[PDB]
Design a protein around this ligand. Structure first.
Ligand SMILES: CCCCCCCCCCCCCCCCCC(=O)OC[C@H](CO[C@@H]1O[C@H](CO[C@H]2O[C@H](CO)[C@H](O)[C@H](O)[C@H]2O)[C@H](O)[C@H](O)[C@H]1O)OC(=O)CCCCCCCCCCCCCCCCC
Ligand SMILES: CCCCCCCCCCCCCCCCCC(=O)OC[C@H](CO[C@@H]1O[C@H](CO[C@H]2O[C@H](CO)[C@H](O)[C@H](O)[C@H]2O)[C@H](O)[C@H](O)[C@H]1O)OC(=O)CCCCCCCCCCCCCCCCC
Ligand code: CLA
Ligand code: CLA
Ligand code: CLA
Ligand code: CLA
Ligand SMILES: CCCCCCCCCCCCCCCC(=O)OC[C@H](CO[C@@H]1O[C@H](CS(=O)(=O)O)[C@@H](O)[C@H](O)[C@H]1O)OC(=O)CCCCCCCCCCCCCCC
Ligand SMILES: CCCCCCCCCCCCCCCC(=O)OC[C@H](COP(=O)(O)OC[C@@H](O)CO)OC(=O)CCCCCCCCCCCCCCC
Ligand SMILES: CC1=C(/C=C/C(C)=C/C=C/C(C)=C/C=C/C=C(C)/C=C/C=C(C)/C=C/C2=C(C)CCCC2(C)C)C(C)(C)CCC1
Ligand SMILES: CC1=C(/C=C/C(C)=C/C=C/C(C)=C/C=C/C=C(C)/C=C/C=C(C)/C=C/C2=C(C)CCCC2(C)C)C(C)(C)CCC1
Ligand SMILES: CC1=C(/C=C/C(C)=C/C=C/C(C)=C/C=C/C=C(C)/C=C/C=C(C)/C=C/C2=C(C)CCCC2(C)C)C(C)(C)CCC1
Ligand code: OEY
Ligand SMILES: [Cl-]
Ligand SMILES: [Cl-]
Ligand SMILES: [Fe+2]
Lengths: 341, 34, 334, 82, 451, 137
């Protein structure tokens, strides 16, 4: 009954917002990541790091506001407030991109805290910690995309900026430079996400349309008591419907709900790996046999080669402004363009 | 007989009071002319 | 009974391994025609002048494609929205050149998938089920109509429909972004919320039911043997899964009604995908995504770029390179 | 059950609640408004005013090009503005 | 508490209008009050458009969808679609809006004050959804009303000043129609045209004679069907084929409205006869054709021989052949060679565009129309930045053809969803399992195993 | 940067006399140019004939010179080809053709001057972007 056991008691008290030991890590970091984003999109520019407006105060709307990444010349600096670049000057810190690493790092630790929170609450209630395990896929995505990818590149400049339109630019950068649609690791991630969404919809619709009549009203929602032992819908009729419509059906409810965990979780993990590849420019950019042929045979054309022409257009037309620190000067005459346009 | 200051109380006000502050800032922004 | 009644009983029989049904009577031949034509074309079809400019695009494996680059190529821009059955061509060779297999495949397939939707209703009625599974399928079905039919209609040509291929899909997506700023369109943003959220809620529900599985096995066997097909009892403690998930957030942010929980799982991705399909369907008529190009200017009048202007720079690179030989006149109006 | 706090339905319907917050909410709003309208938000965060993006005759962006002279660079650009 | 709560009616609040399925009086008030809202919106919106109308700007630069409907019927407009008197728009606006008050008064009266069920107050007005005889009678009355309404458009066109005719000689003009088309080979030939390119089913109707003619057929057919259903009751094959319930009737109409919504979408996008491009802006095909015309005219003025100019691909830069040989504009607009429009048909010969008319007979009004239509192509952004998606802000414009086609596709799609919803529910309801599977007689449990 | 009277000072005529506009006039000429001209001239290009733009160096080399308020007001009254050789009021909106180009009807001489001031001031602010087309977007 030492002071440690007494702090443990109060942290694990049943209250409206459970705290736990993991709250000490979670609540500060998640609040400061959140607040840093809200503060930055409201009040802070990207003028000196990017040559862009990026707050409401400058006249941006919700789609174009961002906490943008620090300038390329900062490298992978931690950009601590008391560090050598800002020297404690808060205003300078904002102007140099300090909010971006502020949000990225506090968010990294808030995510750790949230996963620990899932273990902590699971252990106290005595359930298996599969929801914590599922949360590894968001973590894998966050770390690969926001931390690993820029560490492989020249600087944090090329990480995602925290904004709706900023993320769209990132998407399109990844097409023009990395040919990321062509990457089998992104394709697996796509299948895992669209498959998760399929599983989500087909399972919910199947349960809603094989319910037993457990009440007398037309709103079927009131005929479920969370304490009841019986299944609320018919696994036997669902199984038959799908066996005859689609040829196969689930028969084992446990496997069914495990599969719902497995699919999206694996998808995101697979995309995480491909982004680690892209940190190194280890792209699936090309197909050598097709380039050999195309180079030799000016009548050979596929959708593969048409898309590389699109990529070359993205790179040339977007680099000068997207990478201002490079001082790209492209005369009109070197810009790639088809006829007329 | 409920408490009025709880952990929950701190939770909602840590969010709410900056939210309303920020709203007025954004409201005022709609009248900034270049 | 007479032969017609014998046939009607077979068609609607719930004893067939696969339900046939009246929708199935249309669905089976049209899907078989679409599938057989697709497999042959993907393997063997010769190049297709998709853009009507005598510049054939090779789509098939035998003509130098792999699984990722190969496609059934959309039919020629010279055809526009004209109907091009095999019997309108002067020879199979002419029909192959102008991309006839694309029309045959997509019309047979749209028709067959629409009956797939109907056939879901039909069996649900023979089984005594509630009928709305087919409503869920309408979201992927509507999305398919959008890319294969509605969008060609709005732009005037099946040559601007989505190719039947992996890289052809990407080509369609990139050109769509340049000409509509679909990323900046809220219906697509609703479709992303729909499928991200679907994947999340799929992971959540799966992880939560699994987390609260009742101990029914030893540690050496698969816990899946704790459920027996058709058992009356539930295999997990929903109260325990609520008690975990209620505390993870707060008590009322968590479902305790299994029926409300599952309707939420159905409704979320169905609605989002409805919207993104509506997004393609209305960008077919060139009501495009938000345009904020040069929306911010300073006291003098200089353009202060936002991230929207950077997106426009990339959009411009797709615009000026796509179909590089196809435009003679400065505006790309469809 | 209930973890012992007062229900939100109870509080927001209570008179004492709206007595307290008829003031706090609009005051917090006013303060945020004042934060922007005094021009104070520009100075705390260093956000350009509509007139201080470019010098009158320069079209180039004041982009920082050095890691440790960075803060020195941003100060020099702010004084070529005058 | 006559329904009005879940415990008695069986429906939750979010499905509460379903509490009215068997309260004919309260249901009547819902329909009339709703009709009030429809008439109200037609009233308010016209006045709004009228307040915001600047007769110097084209209608399609001003975000107008209702005034172009009134202009098409002949009122307020002169040669070339020029607005000559705005008073008829005011009249149309005020008269609907005044009407919405008497509609709303009747709706709110029947919904709140009047009898909740009509069946005891009068055998004529009350009904049971399952009375197959009463139902066809109500259908028959509404049929007659529709045929009358159809003939009102004939009356406007033949006896009350005519309709705006974009095709009318000399730039367009209002015109009395005196010889409507009655030849059923034409009128019903439209129903049998294929919907694909260059045919376009009934969307291809390109002259006021066919339009007025077809509305004479439809009005007479609707009046005959009104009588027919008033005097008949459904035959056995029809009795065995349908679900006879209130909700099933709803699903049927939802299906029909969906179908109509999709057709209207394509009507406004392709048809420039009953949606004159003078009022609605150029069609997509029309704008894209107008661009090739514009640069034919420019380059020919500099001395280009537009008929022999080989393009980059080998096809003609300005002129090529369609797949059946017609001479047509080149470039990507080759997909639009089915376009037909009053500004372009004067250059058409028996083989398509005529090189000699191109060399000699292009009037300045055609160069004006084609520049105008090309710079008003139906492209633009959600926030009404006109142009392609990569255009900078400046032009505040979205074509009303875009606005009308996008909205009615969305509406037609959601009504098809509503059809499937209510149709499937109506079938399940009628068979007795819309509330779920009976545990004590689960059907699948009484069926053989699939394998 | 800001909108100074130095920026708002444009050639009145070809004989080097200048006039100096106000903020209200510049905004007026932008609103009017949007309303009347931008459908073909957005950003200083010419969609229906990209070879002729609204660049000050281009208006300079027109016959007669068009890089001054009076020369532009004259163009909006009686537009000619680039070399002066031909009147084009029939296919270019002008006061002389306000019957066929109705958006010109309501315009007055002060409105034309506002539009001309906008066209002449705008490249002093945007530089290459004005009349440069999509390369500079
Ligand atoms: C899953 C679990 C989830 C848990 C997540 C918890 C989050 C914790 C937060 C950790 C954040 C780590 C920041 C690391 C900073 C970094 O790396 O900062 C980078 C610096 C290296 O600095 C960079 O160095 C570069 C190379 O320079 C060298 O080369 C030049 C030659 O031309 C010059 O000589 C130069 O002087 C010389 O130093 C350039 O100078 C860059 O601009 C400069 O930023 O390393 C250093 O700090 C440290 C290098 C030691 C490696 C430490 C491992 C961390 C990296 C893991 C990922 C590596 C793989 C990435 C993909 C590959
Ligand atoms: C029970 C239902 C049974 C149905 C079974 C039969 C189905 C076969 C019909 C399918 C046709 C669909 C594709 C139509 C493509 C097309 O060109 O359709 C457009 C045609 C209009 O055709 C165009 O019509 C034009 C008419 O304009 C001509 O005439 C005009 C006259 O002013 C102008 O002058 C114009 O310039 C001139 O060209 C031209 O002919 C064009 O070349 C021609 O393409 O519209 C039409 O026929 C009108 C209706 C179009 C159908 C609506 C599409 C339905 C969408 C399905 C919804 C998705 C489902 C939801 C998923 C769940
Ligand atoms: C709002 C309009 C409306 C509605 C809802 C009804 C509803 C009904 N009618 Mg009525 N009818 C109407 C208008 C309408 N009618 C008009 C205007 C006329 C005058 C011509 C008639 C003449 C009429 C007759 C003569 C009969 C009905 C009958 C019926 C009943 C069965 C109809 C049926 O089986 O569906 C249609 C279902 C079918 C299987 C029919 C074949 C459908 C094919 C596949 C469609 C394709 C051909 C199509 C008819 C025309 C081609 C157009 C195409 C290009 C799109 C039903 C209660 C029947 C009845 O019971 O009478 C008491 C009957 O015999 N109606
Ligand atoms: C959950 C709590 C938490 C966590 C994990 C972090 C984590 C972080 N913050 Mg945040 N921060 C927090 C709360 C937290 N903060 C709060 C409440 C505020 C409000 C004031 C801030 C305000 C803030 C600012 C303004 C900044 C950070 C920054 C940082 C980063 C660098 C910190 C650093 O270098 O540490 C250095 C300090 C330590 C490592 C602590 C050492 C601990 C002791 C002294 C070691 C000695 C122990 C002894 C030997 C043995 C004792 C044994 C025991 C039994 C007695 C890091 C990501 C910086 C950042 O994000 O830059 C990009 C930054 O600029 N934080
Ligand atoms: C077009 C819209 C529309 C219409 C016409 C109706 C009509 C109706 N509803 Mg539905 N309903 C709607 C939308 C609509 N609803 C929506 C969106 C919802 C979701 C929340 C519901 C949910 C719902 C439920 C849950 C229930 C109804 C019920 C009813 C019926 C009885 C209403 C009653 O007693 O209220 C009494 C209310 C009042 C007396 C308050 C006064 C409101 C009046 C009627 C409005 C007048 C305002 C207007 C400006 C009048 C001035 C004009 C005048 C000069 C002429 C009535 C026929 C009830 C029913 O079916 O009963 C069996 C019922 O239980 N509705
Ligand atoms: C289609 C809509 C509709 C329907 C079916 C009914 C039906 C009914 N109403 Mg209702 N009502 C409506 C609309 C409707 N009403 C509207 C719009 C108003 C507002 C004025 C009212 C106000 C109202 C009141 C205040 C009362 C009724 C009553 C009644 C009942 C007897 C009506 C009667 O006297 O008939 C007898 C038949 C006649 C008098 C023949 C003349 C009918 C009119 C004048 C012909 C007009 C035709 C018109 C040209 C068609 C075009 C209209 C429009 C498109 C321009 C009956 C159940 C009474 C009731 O139920 O008592 C409790 C009652 O007290 N209604
Ligand atoms: C820089 C130093 C300044 C301090 C800054 C604090 C930041 C550090 C993190 C701590 C913030 C969260 C602790 C909340 C304190 C609190 O409300 O309770 C502290 C007490 C007790 O509340 C009690 O609340 C309890 C309910 S619960 O535990 O909060 O859920 C209940 O048991 C009890 O009866 C009730 O009286 O209440 C008061 O503060 C009275 C004034
Ligand atoms: C499905 C969508 C559900 C969303 C919730 C809808 C609630 C609606 C509901 O189901 O019941 C409403 C619920 C119950 O309130 P009371 O019991 O006070 O109300 C009595 C009612 O019965 C009368 O209607 O009120 C709340 O919980 C309000 C939520 C605000 C909570 C503020 C807390 C914020 C905490 C900080 C964020 C959490 C930290 C997370 C860990 C990092
Ligand atoms: C960074 C930093 C920090 C922190 C800060 C913070 C903590 C902040 C916070 C802040 C915040 C916390 C803010 C908030 C805000 C909010 C807002 C801004 C909101 C708004 C919203 C809205 C707008 C909504 C609305 C809506 C919609 C839109 C739709 C639907 C409906 C609704 C109604 C919902 C410190 C100090 C450490 C220092 C260092 C730096
Ligand atoms: C039942 C119900 C409901 C519904 C309601 C409704 C639907 C109604 C409607 C109503 C209506 C529908 C109404 C109407 C109104 C109208 C009016 C009120 C009008 C008036 C007008 C006037 C007065 C005009 C004037 C003028 C003139 C003459 C000239 C120009 C100027 C002006 C415009 C000013 C709800 C949902 C709520 C809830 C539940 C129950
Ligand atoms: C006015 C006009 C015109 C004319 C039109 C007409 C004359 C119309 C007709 C139309 C018609 C004549 C229509 C009809 C329709 C039909 C339908 C829409 C049907 C449907 C059916 C159903 C839906 C059925 C179903 C079923 C089945 C299939 C099986 C058994 C069961 C049941 C019965 C359910 C024209 C274009 C010249 C020009 C412009 C104006
Ligand atoms: O993008 Mn751009 O726009 Ca719709 O067409 Mn005109 O060019 Mn071409 O044929 Mn495929 O695609
Ligand atoms: Cl392309
Ligand atoms: Cl072209
Ligand atoms: Fe489940």
């Amino acid at each position: 009954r030492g002071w440690f056991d007494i702090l443990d008691d109060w942290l694990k008290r049943d209250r409206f917002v459970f705290v736990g030991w993991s709250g000490i890590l979670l609540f500060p970091c998640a609040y400061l990541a959140l607040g840093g984003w809200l503060t930055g999109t409201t009040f802070v520019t990207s003028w000196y790091t990017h040559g862009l407006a990026s707050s409401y105060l400058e006249g941006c709307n919700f789609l174009t506001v961002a906490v943008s990444t620090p300038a390329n010349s900062m490298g992978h600096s931690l950009l601590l407030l008391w560090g050598p670049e800002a020297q404690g000057d808060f205003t300078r810190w904002c102007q140099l991109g300090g909010l971006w690493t502020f949000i990225a790092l506090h968010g990294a630790f808030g995510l750790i805290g949230f996963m620990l929170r899932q273990f902590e609450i699971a252990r106290l209630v005595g359930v298996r910690p599969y929801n914590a395990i599922a949360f590894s896929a968001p973590i894998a995505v966050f770390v690969s995309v926001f931390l690993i990818y820029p560490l492989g590149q020249s600087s944090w400049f090329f990480a995602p900026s925290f904004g709706v339109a900023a993320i769209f630019r990132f998407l399109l950068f990844f097409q023009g430079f990395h040919n990321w649609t062509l990457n089998p690791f992104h394709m697996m991630g796509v299948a895992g996400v669209l498959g998760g969404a399929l599983l989500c919809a087909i399972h919910g619709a199947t349960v809603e349309n094989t319910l037993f009549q457990d009440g007398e009203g037309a709103s079927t929602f009131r005929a479920f008591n969370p304490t009841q032992a019986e299944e609320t819908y018919s696994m036997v009729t669902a199984n038959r419907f799908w066996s005859q419509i689609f040829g196969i059906a689930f028969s084992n409810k446990r496997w069914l709900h495990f599969f719902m965990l497995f699919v999206p979780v694996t998808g995101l993990w697979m995309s995480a790996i491909g982004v680690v590849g892209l940190a190194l420019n280890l792209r699936s950019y090309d197909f050598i046999s097709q380039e050999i042929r195309a180079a030799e045979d000016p009548e050979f054309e596929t959708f593969y080669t048409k898309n590389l022409l699109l990529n070359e257009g993205i790179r040339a037309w977007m680099a000068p402004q997207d990478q201002p620190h490079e001082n790209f000067v492209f005369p009109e005459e070197v810009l790639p363009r088809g006829n007329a346009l | 007989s409920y408490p009025i200051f709880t952990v929950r109380w701190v939770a909602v006000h840590t969010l709410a009071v900056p939210t309303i502050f920020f709203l007025g800032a954004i409201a005022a922004m709609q009248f900034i002319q270049r | 009974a007479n032969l017609w009644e014998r046939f009607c009983n077979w068609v609607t029989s719930t004893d067939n391994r696969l339900y046939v049904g009246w929708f199935g009577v249309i669905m089976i031949p049209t899907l078989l025609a679409a599938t057989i034509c697709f497999v042959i074309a993907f393997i063997a079809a010769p190049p297709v002048d998709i853009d009507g400019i005598r510049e054939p695009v090779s789509g098939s494996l035998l003509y130098g494609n792999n699984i990722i680059t190969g496609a059934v190529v959309p039919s020629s821009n010279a055809i526009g929205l004209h109907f091009y059955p095999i019997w309108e061509a002067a020879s199979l060779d002419e029909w192959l050149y102008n991309g006839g297999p694309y029309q045959l495949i997509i019309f047979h397939f749209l028709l067959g998938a629409s009956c797939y939707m109907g056939r879901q209703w039909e069996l649900s009625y023979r089984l005594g089920m509630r009928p709305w599974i087919c409503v869920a399928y309408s979201a992927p079905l509507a999305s398919a109509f959008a890319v294969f039919l509605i969008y060609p209609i709005g732009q005037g040509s099946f040559s601007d429909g989505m190719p039947l291929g992996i890289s052809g899909t990407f080509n369609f997506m990139i050109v769509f972004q340049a000409e509509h700023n679909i990323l900046m369109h809220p219906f697509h943003q609703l479709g992303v919320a729909g499928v991200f959220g679907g994947a999340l809620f799929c992971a959540m529900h799966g992880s939560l039911v699994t987390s609260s599985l009742i101990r029914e096995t030893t540690e050496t066997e698969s816990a899946n043997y704790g459920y027996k097909f058709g058992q009356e009892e539930e295999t997990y403690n929903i109260v325990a899964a609520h008690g975990y998930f209620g505390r993870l957030i707060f008590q009322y942010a968590s479902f305790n009604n299994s029926r409300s929980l599952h309707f939420f799982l159905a409704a979320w991705p169905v609605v989002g995908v409805w919207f993104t399909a509506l997004g393609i369907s209305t960008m077919a008529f060139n009501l495009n995504g938000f345009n904020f190009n040069h929306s911010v200017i300073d006291a003098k009048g200089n353009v202060i770029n936002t991230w929207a202007d950077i997106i426009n720079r990339a959009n411009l690179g797709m615009e000026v390179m796509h179909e590089r030989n196809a435009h003679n006149f400065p505006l790309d109006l469809a | 059950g209930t973890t012992g706090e007062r229900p939100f339905s109870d509080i927001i319907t209570s008179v004492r609640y709206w007595v307290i917050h008829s003031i706090t909410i609009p005051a917090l709003f006013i303060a945020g408004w004042l934060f922007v309208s005094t021009g104070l938000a520009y100075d705390v965060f260093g956000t350009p005013r509509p007139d201080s993006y470019y010098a009158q005759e320069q079209r180039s962006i004041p982009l920082v090009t050095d890691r440790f002279e960075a803060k020195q660079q941003v100060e020099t650009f702010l004084e070529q503005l005058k | 508490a006559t329904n009005r709560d879940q415990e008695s009616s069986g429906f939750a609040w979010w499905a509460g209008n379903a509490r009215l399925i068997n309260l004919s009086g309260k249901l009547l008030g819902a329909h009339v009050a709703h009709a009030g809202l429809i008439v109200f919106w037609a009233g308010a919106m016209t006045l709004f458009e009228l307040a915001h109308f600047i007769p110097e700007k084209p209608m399609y630069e001003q975000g107008l969808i209702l005034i172009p409907h009134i202009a098409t019927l002949g009122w307020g407009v002169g040669p070339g679609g020029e607005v000559v008197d705005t008073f008829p728009f005011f009249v149309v606006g005020v008269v609907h809006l005044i009407s919405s008050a008497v509609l709303g008064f009747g709706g709110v009266y029947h919904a709140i004050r009047g009898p909740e069920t009509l069946e005891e107050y009068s055998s004529f007005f009350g009904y049971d959804w399952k009375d197959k005889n009463k139902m066809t009678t109500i259908l028959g009355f509404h049929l007659i009303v529709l045929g009358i309404g159809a003939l009102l458009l004939v009356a406007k066109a033949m006896f009350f000043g005519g309709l705006y005719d974009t095709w009318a000689p000399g730039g367009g003009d209002v015109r009395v129609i005196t010889n409507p088309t009655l030849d059923p080979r034409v009128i019903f030939g439209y129903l049998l045209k294929s919907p694909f390119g260059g045919e376009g089913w009934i969307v291809s109707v390109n002259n006021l004679e066919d339009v007025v003619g077809g509305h004479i057929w439809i009005g007479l057919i609707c009046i005959a069907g009104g009588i027919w259903h008033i005097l008949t009751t459904p035959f056995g094959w029809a009795r065995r084929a349908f679900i006879w319930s209130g909700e099933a009737y709803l699903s049927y109409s939802l299906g029909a409205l969906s179908m109509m919504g999709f057709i209207a979408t394509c009507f406004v996008w392709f048809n420039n006869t009953v949606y004159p491009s003078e009022f609605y802006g150029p069609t997509g095909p029309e704008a894209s054709q107008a661009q090739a015309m514009t640069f034919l005219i420019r380059d020919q003025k500099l001395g280009a021989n537009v008929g022999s100019a080989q393009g980059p691909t080998g096809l003609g830069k300005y002129l090529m052949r369609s797949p059946t040989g017609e001479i047509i504009f080149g470039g990507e607009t080759m997909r639009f060679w089915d376009f037909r429009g009053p500004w372009l048909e004067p250059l058409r010969g028996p083989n398509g565009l005529d090189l000699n008319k191109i060399k000699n007979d292009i009037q300045p009004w055609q160069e004006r129309r084609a520049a105008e239509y090309m710079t008003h192509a139906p492209l633009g952004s959600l926030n009404s930045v006109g142009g392609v998606a990569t255009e900078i802000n400046s032009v505040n414009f979205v074509s009303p053809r875009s606005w009308l086609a996008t909205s009615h596709f969305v509406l037609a799609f959601f009504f098809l969803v509503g059809h499937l919803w209510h149709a499937g529910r109506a079938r399940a309801a009628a068979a007795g399992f819309e509330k779920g599977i009976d545990r004590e007689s689960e059907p699948v449990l009484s069926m053989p195993s699939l394998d | 940067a800001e909108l100074t009277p130095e920026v708002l000072t444009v050639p009145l005529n070809s004989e080097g006399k200048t006039i100096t506009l106000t903020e209200k006039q510049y905004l007026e000429g932008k609103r009017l140019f949007q309303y009347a001209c931008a459908s073909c001239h957005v950003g200083g290009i010419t969609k229906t004939n990209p070879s002729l733009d609204l660049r000050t160096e281009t208006l300079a080399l027109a016959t007669p010179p068009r890089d001054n308020i009076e020369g532009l007001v004259d163009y909006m009254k009686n537009p000619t080809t680039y070399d002066g050789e031909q009147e084009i009021a029939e296919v270019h909106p002008s006061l002389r053709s306000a019957d066929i180009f109705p958006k010109m009807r309501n315009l007055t001489e002060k409105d034309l001057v506002a539009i001309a001031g906008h066209i002449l001031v705008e490249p002093k602010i945007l530089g290459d972007k004005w009349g440069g087309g999509k390369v500079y977007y």
